[PDB]
């Protein structure tokens, strides 16, 4: 089957490329990275996080594999000495396929846009252009509070391990279909009020951004960064859409935050 | 069909509680304290959570209702000047099931015993004896952490506003079936070192505690309170069993964690 | 005794401030915003900083004062129906004098700069310039941390009810001679390795904040917020001077602490 | 002049013990743990707090030193292979001390008792006995706050280190003549209130806790901790006494917590 494997660049990274495309010349099997069925990764979880947003239109057609050539990531999850292995698995067709939960990001302007969706594996912020942050926050068409502070974070399950974590965030198992909503140095006093603790929200619940003031915004979606303009609502829920992993072999979720935060 | 009503016992929910029991004497309705289909708790939440644990053999038998005589509690959820439309409706049969994730825990031993198992509906927290508190954490067969601290928190959903929130844990909707887990005062330096964030487990997930040292622990139960001696294993998982509610009208969580912290 | 009055600029503020002067006008008392001994802020504490940021070159030779429009600020501290009692008493020379006190910030860069030294009275506050954000922090010329996260806060005493405060800094006594340093967002993993918690530190201790990468800075200081460029080095201390307040009545910084976040 | 040495006990403290005091016989240089004049502890930072809760009515007239037979304390202070070094510099007189703050802890009771009061190196805690716990937090004879919760923390400034650190408390220099009050697990809703955030409070500054409910309390003292009973105020402030240690050598306080926090 068509496969197709990104590199970080480096020396190290391109060279087990290389290595793994010849490898895969032995078998069928045949490189196409406009229609891939597989996506390796070579490199970090950003390495990662771009080759996913390459394929952001293709998901339900492809199944994902990171290779991690420092650490350790959260995405990849196999390392450089495991790569001939790799190859004989995935040419083998030896692998069940796993699912996560993606979070939906729509924002919405005044005429003349013109809506934008976005697709994020780790999380979207909103922070100001700079700016005092305020908004109105609204859970499924209820005023729940209007937010004073630096800005708003909403984690899928595997982005918990990342931005929602410096937040305070709780880390949710990535089997959990739900994202998780955390504050960024919220103002609290008798008369501005925030809940403060993390949210969590199930499929089908929509969280709503809704400016006070101040229209414009810093919009996040994992790596990408734009300064939004006119804006009206930001609209966050759970996608219907996952990513598919291929696995391969057992590496528990909870094995790898042992991993990166406790140690090994 | 067949009904009971616990009361606070201050004036004002004993006399709320004879009035829907006059009420509910002009339908059928039939009081029975021993195996009731429909538990009313008149008072707060402390009121509701004896309810519950009163009839915990009955669960899968049983409908839950509170009525709140001070605050708004997020287990009762009728203002008394309700009281009347309550019995109309629950007399008439006038109402939609809601079921709650609950909490199991298993608290094993050296012989004799002989082990205890609960369940909880808002949490189950350990402490030590007093006592330096250190436990092994193991999720699914494989050590996660040793903490060191004052104790652990697992809380389920609808517990998250309680004991949970006062911990830094994420508030979760409880149509999540999940368990959360937060520190208490973690010691962390060089040397020892806990994962910090809240962690959330889904359905299957077993969280097991394990002496280091010290074998004896104060755990707690929702409002119960026990020193357990001679502990091998404390056990955490979703339970299998569900509490069920009897509504009735629209009261969003969202709404209720609004009304409770927000305001109104 | 020269004074001069600023004011938020909104109706009510102006009115008040004319009545001031008018008021003024019956004793001697000289305006004059050149070379006040008297700076009167009329609004909120936006305004008492930017009255301190005015005439932050005469603070020795000035005495400040707060009147709120509205809340009910940490500089001001006088309520308009109070503003006759004031005027006659600031014309009679009749307060003693307290002093907090203030940051010094210096930003060195590599040639050209011509390092800039500021004073603040809230904090100074270091971000990216967008951009992964990792300085090294050094204290007291030795190497203490490498921080990776959103940015730093160092406040003054009488800044940790602000933006100290949604960091989870402590709230400090401004009779304390110190600067409290706290987080944003800090990454902690078994790799990257912050302190976390917020660091109180004496007068003549020197925190020193320099670039990993990435030598462009976005540099807060009060309400002033500046990219600088190819920064080598940024320098906090608690200043050699103070600001000083004409009292007057009692008016207890933790009263003012309660009044602001518990109630009143 | 007079010495003692207590140790922890275990084959190691004991050996570097006896090693010390043989050479101690070749200067002059006296043992007497009646009336020392200096005490040095041998093990870690417990044993340490234990010398100083022995000699805690001669402190004017003595100066303590660590060792630490493991990690590295904030107490000791010195690696057991500077021993000799450490006999040789104590005998010929050669050091400055250096005092850190203490607290003081006031109990009263009702009729018998009959106040009590303690010092404290690390800190005092209150929690109730089991048991919600409500105090009233009185600073300066005004109402602040009624607290709800687990208890709460009144830490000195090397105390921050300890158990201040595990509750989000600031890690304070100790030429800082200050204490710092931590909550534990505070219940926070629209109508229980409390600040949330640490307080550090200066000297002459009185803390005052009292009893809503409730008159039974928990109480620690560093390693003590004891149930009071009929308790009518807890009193906090900082000690007018202090700790002496000598020093010796440069061993700066942010280079102890980089060491114990950080690495090495
Ligand atoms: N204060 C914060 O915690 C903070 C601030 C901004 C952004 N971020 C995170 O960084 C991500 C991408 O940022 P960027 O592109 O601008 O580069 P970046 O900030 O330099 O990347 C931050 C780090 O996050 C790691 N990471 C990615 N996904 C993760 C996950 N699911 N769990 C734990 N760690 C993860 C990356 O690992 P690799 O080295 O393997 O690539 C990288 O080292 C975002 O999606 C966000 O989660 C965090
Ligand atoms: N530091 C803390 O946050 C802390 C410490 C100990 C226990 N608790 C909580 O108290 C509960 C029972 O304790 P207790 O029997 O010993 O009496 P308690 O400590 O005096 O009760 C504590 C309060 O918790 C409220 N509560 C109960 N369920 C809740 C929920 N799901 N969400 C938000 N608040 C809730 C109760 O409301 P009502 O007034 O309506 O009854 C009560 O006022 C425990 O299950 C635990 O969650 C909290
Ligand atoms: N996430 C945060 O907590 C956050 C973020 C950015 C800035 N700030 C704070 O805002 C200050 C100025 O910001 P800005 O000029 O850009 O306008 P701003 O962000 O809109 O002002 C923020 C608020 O801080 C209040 N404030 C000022 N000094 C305070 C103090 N010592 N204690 C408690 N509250 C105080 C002001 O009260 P008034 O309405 O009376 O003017 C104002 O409402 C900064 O010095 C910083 O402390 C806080
Ligand atoms: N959750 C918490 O953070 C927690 C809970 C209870 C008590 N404590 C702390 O433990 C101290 C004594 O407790 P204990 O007698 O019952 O024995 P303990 O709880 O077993 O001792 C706790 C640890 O605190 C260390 N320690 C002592 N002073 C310190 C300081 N100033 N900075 C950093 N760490 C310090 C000790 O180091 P050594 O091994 O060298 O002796 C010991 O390992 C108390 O004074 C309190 O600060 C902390």
Redesign the interface.
Same mark, same amino acid.
């Given at each position: 089957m068509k496969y197709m494997i990104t590199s970080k660049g480096d020396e190290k990274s391109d060279l087990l490329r290389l290595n793994m495309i010849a490898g895969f010349g032995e078998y069928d099997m045949e490189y196409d990275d406009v229609e891939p069925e597989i996506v390796i990764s070579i490199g970090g979880d950003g390495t990662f996080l771009s080759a996913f947003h390459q394929y952001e239109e293709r998901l339900d057609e492809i199944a994902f594999i990171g290779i991690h050539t420092g650490?350790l990531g959260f995405y990849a999850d196999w390392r450089p000495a495991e790569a001939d292995k790799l190859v004989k698995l995935l040419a083998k067709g030896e692998y069940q396929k796993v699912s996560y939960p993606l979070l939906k990001t729509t924002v919405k302007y005044g005429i003349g846009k013109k809506e934008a969706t976005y697709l994020a594996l780790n999380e979207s912020t909103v922070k100001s252009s700079?700016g005092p942050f305020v908004v109105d926050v609204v859970?499924?068409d209820?005023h729940?509070?209007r937010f004073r502070?630096?800005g708003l974070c909403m984690s899928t399950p595997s982005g918990t391990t990342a931005?929602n974590?410096? @937040?305070?965030?709780? @880390?949710?198992?990535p &089997?959990?279909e739900?994202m998780?909503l955390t504050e960024?140095? &919220?103002?609290?006093?008798? +008369?501005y009020?925030?809940?403060?603790? %993390? @949210? +969590?929200? %199930?499929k089908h619940?929509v969280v709503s951004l809704q400016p006070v003031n101040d229209k414009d915004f810093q919009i996040s979606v994992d790596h990408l960064?734009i300064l939004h303009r006119d804006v009206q609502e930001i609209r966050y829920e759970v996608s219907a859409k996952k990513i598919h992993f291929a696995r391969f072999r057992s590496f %528990?979720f909870?094995?790898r +935050?042992?991993? &990166?935060?406790?140690?090994?």
């Open positions: 650490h700079g859970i499924n209820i729940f509070e502070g630096d931005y974590k410096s @937040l305070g965030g709780a @880390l949710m198992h &089997s959990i739900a998780q960024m140095a &919220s103002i609290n006093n008798r +008369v009020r925030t809940i403060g603790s %993390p @949210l +969590v929200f %199930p619940h960064s %528990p909870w094995r +935050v042992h991993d &990166s935060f406790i140690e090994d």
